[PDB]
Amino acid sequence: SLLHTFWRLPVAVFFEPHEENVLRCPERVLRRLLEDAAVTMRGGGWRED
């Protein structure tokens, strides 16, 4: 009747999937870090040379 240890279920707060649960993106920093990569991967390096 003392401090023993048993197998409780591991409680973890999660989220079941839905159709309108969106992953929002930081536009003004991460798209503007993607901007220079998108403009620098157009010209050259086509893997056909």
Binding site: H4, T5, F6, W7, P10
Partner: protein, 49 residues
Amino acid sequence: TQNINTVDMGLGYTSNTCVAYVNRVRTDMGVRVQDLFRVFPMNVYRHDE
């Protein structure tokens, strides 16, 4: 049904028995040791790993 009634008719032990003959064994006389997990199916450790 048939209600029968028996009353003893002797001071001392009037009926003797003895372990006399042995045919076989049901067990194996083996050494396959039982597991402590099924006889205690609730105890676990704390750390999950």
